[PDB]
C-alpha cells in the first residue's frame, strides 16, 4: 500500500522502509529487512556500507555538551551494502522484489535478524533542566559509504534512522494472584489476619483496577488507617545492578476496626500521566523524536530462561500497609504496622491491522 | 492553517443498485488519516471508513473506497434504497479538525 | 526528514 | 453503554449556561472527548475536546477563550463553560467520544443538544 | 559482721539475709540460703512453708488498678521450713550454724541453688503517665505457713523479699571489634569504601568511647554528612518474640569529602540519663523499690550455649550512615546513602570489697 | 520496714 | 591527674564572683563533685555538689538560692554561682571529687581557695 | 534533720607509739555509711577510713577503727612522730551532709 522513505544530504540515496515499530514475541523475534537505492556515478571506492546497531545511551557522566552521552554496545551489526558478497545467497520478500521492479536493477537488499533478549524500547522522564537530548534504550540503523572500512563517519555522506522494540499482551488469560498474612504480638496470642485480592493480572493503560480487601482484627488495639500503593519497580544496568522504585499514585483510607473483629472492603485506583509530570525518571515507552508516549509498559522477561539480561527492565506491584494504634506497656518505642502486596502487569493489547501512528492530533 | 477541504459531487439522483462514487480532497497531503461519514435526518452520524480504507464492524461489502495521491474517493458498489442518506468526507491529522460540507441522495 | 510513499500493488 | 447531556436551554444573549455529558461504563482516562455544533442547514464544526489523560484542551478560535470544558473523573460528567454568547451562535451540539489509544474515529454519538434565543 | 533482717505483722516471724544481690558468673550461678526464727507456740497447724519464685511481671494488658499484672512464672521452688524433711541432710555453711548459735535452737534454714540461663534483673524506663508499680524482671521470696497446701497467702502472716540477678564484667580482655565496606554505582566502576574501629570492647558507666573512621571517596560524587548513632536492641519475649531499638545518643558530623580522595577522623560520644528521661520503655537495671538506677549494662548470654532463653535480653551497636550528594541522571529517584555498624559492651566491673550501696545521698 | 543487725564473731 | 581552680579575689560586700574548677583526665559523668568551705580555725562544712548524670543540685540551707553551681562537658570545668555575699561569708574553699559509681569517699582535693572583704 | 554529730577526745599529748583511740557518735542509726579524714596544716584533707572499716591504698597498718552500734571510733595501735596532725569522723548516709569539729595530736 504505502511506505516511508529517506535520502541522504548529497542526493545520492535514498532508504525505503516498510515500518518502524518490530514485534517482539519473546519466544521469537521479528526480521528486518529492506533495500536501498545508489547513485553509481557517485562512488568510485569501490565499497559500500550500512550497520545496525542497538545500545543504552544517555548523558555521560555529567557531560552538558550536546551529545555527549555513554554510548553501550549491547548488539552491533553489519553488512557491506556493495558490492555483493556470497553471503548474500538468501531468500527475500515478495515486497522487496516488488520494490526492486518498481525501482529497476539499481537497488540493493539488506537484512539483519535480532538475537532474542534484548532491552526493550524505554526512556527516562525528563525533568525541566533536561534540555539536551533523551534518556533511554534505543534501535537504530545508519547507511555510509568508503573506500576503507577504518574510514570514519563523513557528514554529507550519511544517513541514519531508529525503530521501537515493543511487546503486545498474551492472549491467554493468566493466573489471579491473591495474598495473605498473618501478624502476632507478644502480649496477646491473637493474631492478625490480612488477605488481598485482584481481579485479573493483565490491565491496559487507563483502564482502572480494583481490589478486594478483607481484614481480621483478633486483639484488643484497633486498626486506625491503611494505605494503598501502586509503585513502579525499575531494574537498571550500566556498569553494575541497581533498584529503585517510585509511586505512581497512592491512597489511604480511613476505616477503622473495631477490637477482636473482621471486615472487608474494595478500592479502586488509576494510573495517569498528568498528576505525575513534574517527576524525573519514571518510566516512559520509547519516544520517536518528541512524541508524548505514555506510561512505560511493563517488560515481560524472556520466558522461563530467566537469563541476567543486561540494560532496563522494568515491573508493577500493588502494596497496602496499615497503621496500628500504639498502646500498652510500649508506646513510641515499638513497632504497629502490618503490610502486604501484589504484582501484576499493565501493557496494550496487539494492534489488530493498525500500529499506533505519530501523534495523529497534530498541532 | 486548517485543511482547506473540498468534496464532490454535491448529490445524485437515479435507479437502485448502480455504482456512484464520491470524491475528496484536501490542501495538503494527509498520508492516510483520513474517514468517511454517514447520517441521516434527525439522527447522529455514523462512522463509515476510517484510516481511509478501514471497514467498521456491521458494514455490507457493497461500502468501498479509496486514496488516490493527495484525492481520496468513497463508493458504493451497488447502492440500496435504504442508502439515502448524508455522507462526510473526513480529515483528522492536525488541528482544527475539520469537515465537509455534505453530500444528498436521491 | 522522513518521506512516505504509495504502492500500486 | 450510553451517554447522556443535558444544561441547555431558551436565554437571552450576554448569558450562558453549563452544558453537560455525562459517561458510561468507561471512565475519561480510557478515551477523549470532543464536541461538535451543527448550524441549520450546515455541515458540522468542532468547536472543542478534552485529553484528560494528558490533561490538555484545545478550542476552535471562533470560540477560544469564550469557552470552556471541565469534567470529573468520580462524576464521570463533563460540563461546558462558556461566556458572551451570540444568537448567531445557535447551534445543534452533540457529545462523542474517541479512544485515547488511539483517535481513529467517533464511535459513540450522544442525541444532540439545541440552543436559541428571542 | 552486719546482716540485714524483717519480721512479720503477727509479730511471729523474723527472716535474715546475708545479701541481697546475687552474681551470675555464667558458667555458674551462686547458692542462695538463710535462715528464719518462729514462734511454736504462734503455731499449732503443724506445717510452715516457705518460696522462693522467679518470674516476668509488668502492666497486664490495660489493668489500671493497682497490682493488677501479668505473672509468668520463669522459675518456682518451695520448701516446708518446718516440720524438716530428710531431703534437708546436707551442710550447712558457717555462717549459718554462727547464727543459730546466736539465735539458740529455735530457727530453721533454707536453701536454693538456680538454674543457669534465667533473665536477669531489669526495668523498664516508666513515664509520668506510668504512675502503676514498675514493670521489669524480678526475683522474689516469700514466707509464710498453713494446716494445709490448699491454703492460700494470709495477710496478717506473711511476709515477701526481692533480690537482684546481676552479673560482672569478665576480666579477660576481648578483641577489638572493627568493620569495613564498599559501596559501588551503577555510572562510574569506582567503588566507595568505609572502616571503622573503636578502641576497646569492654567499657564502664560513664566512660567515653571513641570511634577511628576512614573515607574512601573515589568517584565524581561526594559526601555530604556523616551520621554517628548509638542504639540499645531491646530482646523481648513474653508471648512470642519480638524486637525493637531506641538510640541512647547520636551526632552528625559536618565534614565533606572532596570527589576522588580519602580522608579519615576520629568521634567521641558519651551516653547518660540525663538526656533521655522522658522516653518511655528504656532499659534500666533492675530497681529494688525507687531507687534511680542507671541505664542497663549489657547482658552477656550463655556462654557458646546459645539457648532459647525466654525473657528479656539486651545489648549495644555503634552505626554510622553518609550522605551523599543527589545528581546526574538520578535525581530523587534513587537512594545514595551508606552505613557500617558494629558492637560492643558497656557494664561495671566485679565489685572488690563492697556492693553498691541504697541511694547513698539520702535526702 | 527493713531492719540490720551486728556480728560481733 | 590533677585539678586546678580559680576565680576569686578581694572585694566589697554585695557582688559576687565565678569560681571555677577544672577537672582532668575523666568527664564529669564518670563522677560527681561538691564544694566545702572552712571558716578560719573552724572545721568543715559542705556547701554545694553537682550530679551531671542524674543532673540534680544539692545546697546548704545556709546558702541555698543565693548560691547555685554551673558546668559544662566540653570545657570539663565547673563554675561556682552566688549572690549576695556576706563579708563574713569568707572561708577557704575546696574542690574535689568523688567516683559516681560510687560515693564513699573524696579522694582528690584541689589547693584550695580564699576570699576576703575590706 | 542533719546528722548531730559528737567526736572526743578533742586531743592528747603523749610518747611515741602508745596507743590512742578517738571515738565518734551520731544522733541517729548510719548503719556504716561512715568515714574518717585528716588533714594538716595548711594542706588539703585526707581520706583514712571508708565504709568505716575499710582501710585505703598505702596507709600503714597502724591506723585502725571500728564500729560499736551507733557509736564509733578510730584508732591507732602505736603512734608516730610523723603523725602529729588533725583527724575528722565523717557521715555520708544522709544530706546535708555534716563533718566533725575535728582533732589535734601533740
Known amino acids: ?86 553471503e548474500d545467497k538468501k531468500p527475500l520478500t515478495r515486497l522487496q522484489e516488488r520494490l526492486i521492479k518498481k525501482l529497476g536493477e539499481h537497488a540493493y537488499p539488506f537484512t539483519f535478524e535480532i538475537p532474542p533478549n534484548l532491552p526493550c524500547s524505554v526512556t527516562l522522564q525528563p525533568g525541566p533542566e533536561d534540555t539536551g537530548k533523551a534518556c533511554g534504550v534505543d534501535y537504530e540503523v545508519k547507511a555510509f559509504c568508503a573506500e576503507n572500512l577504518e574510514e570514519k563517519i563523513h557528514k554529507r555522506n550519511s544517513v541514519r534512522l531508529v525503530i521501537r522494540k515493543v511487546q503486545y499482551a498474551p492472549e491467554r488469560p493468566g493466573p489471579q494472584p491473591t495474598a495473605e498474612t498473618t501478624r502476632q504480638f507478644l502480649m496477646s496470642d491473637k493474631p492478625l489476619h490480612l488477605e488481598a485480592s485482584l481481579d485479573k493480572e493483565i490491565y491496559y493503560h487507563g483502564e482502572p483496577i480494583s481490589v478486594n480487601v478483607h481484614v481480621t482484627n483478633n486483639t484488643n488495639k484497633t486498626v486506625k488507617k491503611i494505605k494503598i500503593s501502586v509503585r513502579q519497580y525499575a531494574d537498571i544496568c550500566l556498569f553494575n545492578t541497581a533498584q529503585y522504585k517510585c509511586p505512581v499514585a497512592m491512597e489511604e483510607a480511613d476505616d477503622t476496626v473495631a477490637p477482636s473483629s473482621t471486615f472487608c472492603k474494595v478500592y479502586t485506583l488509576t494510573p495517569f500521566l498528568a498528576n505525575n509530570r513534574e517527576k524525573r525518571g519514571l518510566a516512559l515507552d520509547g519516544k520517536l523524536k518528541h ?44 513497632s504497629s504496622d502490618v503490610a502486604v502486596e501484589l504484582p501484576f502487569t499493565l501493557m496494550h493489547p496487539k494492534p489488530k491491522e493498525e500500529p499506533p501512528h505519530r501523534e495523529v492530533p497534530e498541532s | 492553517s486548517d485543511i482547506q477541504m473540498t468534496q464532490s459531487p454535491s448529490s445524485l439522483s437515479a435507479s437502485v443498485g448502480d455504482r456512484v462514487t464520491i470524491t475528496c480532497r484536501a490542501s495538503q497531503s494527509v498520508s492516510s488519516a483520513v474517514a468517511w461519514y454517514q447520517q441521516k435526518p434527525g439522527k447522529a452520524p455514523k462512522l463509515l471508513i476510517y484510516s481511509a480504507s478501514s471497514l467498521y464492524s456491521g458494514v455490507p461489502s457493497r461500502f468501498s473506497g479509496s486514496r488516490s495521491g493527495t484525492d481520496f474517493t468513497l463508493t458504493i458498489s451497488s447502492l440500496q434504497p435504504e442508502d439515502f442518506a448524508t455522507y462526510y468526507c473526513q480529515q483528522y491529522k492536525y488541528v482544527p479538525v475539520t469537515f465537509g460540507q455534505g453530500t444528498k441522495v436521491e | 526528514e522522513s518521506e512516505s510513499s504509495s504502492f500500486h500493488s | 453503554v450510553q451517554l447522556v447531556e443535558s444544561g441547555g436551554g431558551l436565554v437571552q444573549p450576554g448569558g450562558s449556561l453549563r452544558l453537560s455529558c455525562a459517561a458510561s461504563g468507561f471512565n475519561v482516562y480510557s478515551s477523549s472527548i470532543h464536541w461538535v455544533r451543527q448550524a441549520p442547514g450546515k455541515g458540522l464544526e468542532w468547536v472543542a475536546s478534552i485529553s484528560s489523560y494528558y490533561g490538555y484542551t484545545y478550542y476552535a478560535d471562533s470560540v477560544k477563550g469564550r469557552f470552556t470544558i471541565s469534567a470529573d473523573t468520580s462524576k464521570n460528567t463533563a460540563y461546558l463553560q462558556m461566556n458572551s454568547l451570540r444568537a448567531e451562535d445557535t447551534a445543534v451540539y452533540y457529545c462523542a467520544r474517541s479512544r485515547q489509544f488511539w483517535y481513529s474515529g467517533l464511535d459513540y454519538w450522544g442525541q444532540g443538544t439545541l440552543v436559541t434565543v428571542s
Chains 1, 5 share one sequence.
Open chain 1, 291 to 334: 512524541e508524548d508516549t505514555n506510561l512505560a509498559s511493563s517488560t515481560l522477561l524472556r520466558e522461563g530462561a530467566n537469563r541476567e539480561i543486561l540494560g532496563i527492565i522494568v515491573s508493577y506491584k500493588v502494596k497496602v500497609k496499615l497503621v496500628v494504634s500504639r498502646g500498652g506497656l510500649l508506646g513510641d518505642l515499638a
Open chain 1, 1 to 86: 500500500t504505502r511506505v516511508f522513505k529517506k535520502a541522504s544530504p548529497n542526493g545520492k540515496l535514498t532508504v525505503y522502509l516498510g515500518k518502524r515499530d518490530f514485534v517482539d514475541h519473546i519466544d521469537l523475534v521479528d526480521p528486518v529487512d529492506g533495500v536501498v537505492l545508489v547513485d553509481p556515478e557517485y562512488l568510485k571506492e569501490r565499497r559500500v556500507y550500512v550497520t545496525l546497531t542497538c545500545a543504552f545511551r544517555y548523558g555521560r557522566e555529567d557531560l552538558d555538551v550536546l551529545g555527549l552521552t555513554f554510548r553501550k554496545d549491547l548488539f552491533v551489526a553489519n553488512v557491506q551494502s556493495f558490492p555483493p558478497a556470497p
